[PDB]
Design a protein around this ligand. Structure first.
Ligand code: MN
Length: 344
RNA sequence: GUUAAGUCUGGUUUCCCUCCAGGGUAUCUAAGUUGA
């Protein structure tokens, strides 16, 4: 609310909110806020009438309703803005799919149902989840998304940088019956997003979180990759890059495994380090531990690719479902690698 | 006062090692699922 204003008006609204703060008063704090509103009407030369009695009371009553109910009161402009941004993000994702040799079955606004090669699925997931939040570097036709908005030749249309987004991936044999393939895709993307909890901190406190993940499945293997690790998934221009940050790590690691700098034994050798590292309790200890686990399959001479130290302590939970999952994000990273390869 | 004649023995006994140091340091592994 206080940020929604542009101009000296923000002072009035935040001091009203302070009058709403801690059940402070009505009919009483309507002076401090008013000794500025009347100041403002006297700050001009042609004002006609003021019923500040009614007006500041209604202005406080608005925010009081907002907070008591607990939701921004929706007006038609809200709906048409969300829907327009939905369609524009859809236009972005249409050429994001086409950027990765994909075939759209249904891409409409919020959702998506495409078919891509098993090779560029991770790239597409990353770039799509970022473009949904208006954060990208490509021109996608006539549309050049810019850090939370959608620039279209000087037109800055909004985006959905607050809305999370889940992702299901089914690595399927071309002879697999599409009935069960589509049903498994839908049932993962439904069950899992409601049923999984992964560690997140907002306000500096390790809490849980449910949506905005990426589930993978390969004929029995499953993995989940959290996409935000922040509950106001972005609130600054800073956190725009944090989106899908775990995915570029998996992409880099797959970039090392292919070129023959790491051996796929990496994907079968993390279990022994996992006991040590999840009971481990210091940062740089676990840092060196993963560095040397990789440095038994080697990544490089004079190692250069470490895991970015935000990935540890992240524990993924599940509400006791047949979907078995490792309780930690790095084991899920390596299962995502197993699932991607298993389809190549 | 005088005569003669030398004869016996032919190195023993102790101590033969004592004390400390009995490994130290560095490396502790690196580099690397595909087809029906
Ligand atoms: Mn649903």
């Amino acid at each position: 609310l206080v940020n929604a204003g542009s101009g000296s008006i923000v002072d009035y609204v935040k001091t009203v909110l302070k009058c709403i703060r801690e059940n402070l008063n009505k009919c009483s704090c309507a002076e401090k806020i008013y000794s500025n509103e009347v100041a403002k009407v006297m700050f001009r030369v042609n004002v006609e009438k003021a019923n500040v009695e009614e007006e500041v009371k209604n202005s406080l009553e608005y925010f009081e309703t907002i907070l008591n109910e607990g939701r921004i009161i929706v007006t038609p402009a809200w709906h048409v803005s969300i829907s327009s941004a939905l369609n524009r993000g859809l236009l972005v994702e249409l050429e994001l799919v086409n950027k990765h040799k994909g075939f759209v079955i249904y891409a409409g606004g919020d959702d998506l149902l495409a078919m891509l090669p098993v090779d560029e699925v991770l790239d597409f997931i990353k770039e799509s989840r970022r473009a949904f939040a208006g954060f990208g570097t490509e021109k996608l036709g006539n549309m050049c998304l810019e850090n939370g908005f959608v620039r279209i030749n000087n037109a800055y249309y909004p985006s959905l940088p607050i809305v999370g987004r889940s992702y299901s991936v089914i690595i399927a044999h071309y002879a697999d019956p599409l009935f069960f393939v589509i049903n498994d895709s839908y049932n993962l993307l439904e069950e899992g997003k409601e049923i999984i909890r992964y560690r997140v901190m907002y306000n500096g406190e390790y809490k849980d979180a449910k949506k905005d993940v990426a589930i993978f499945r390969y004929q029995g293997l499953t993995s989940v990759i959290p996409l935000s690790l922040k509950r106001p998934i972005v609130s600054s221009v800073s956190d725009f890059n944090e989106i899908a940050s775990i995915i570029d790590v998996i992409l880099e690691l797959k970039k090392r495994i292919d070129e023959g700098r790491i051996s796929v034994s990496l994907l079968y050798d993390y279990e022994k380090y996992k006991h040590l590292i999840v009971a481990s309790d210091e940062k740089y200890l676990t840092e060196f531990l993963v560095k040397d686990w990789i440095k038994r399959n080697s990544l490089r001479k004079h190692v250069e690719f470490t895991i970015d130290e935000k990935l540890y302590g992240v524990r993924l939970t599940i509400e006791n479902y047949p979907i078995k999952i490792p309780n930690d994000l790095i084991s899920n990273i390596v299962y995502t690698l197993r699932i991607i390869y298993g389809g190549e």
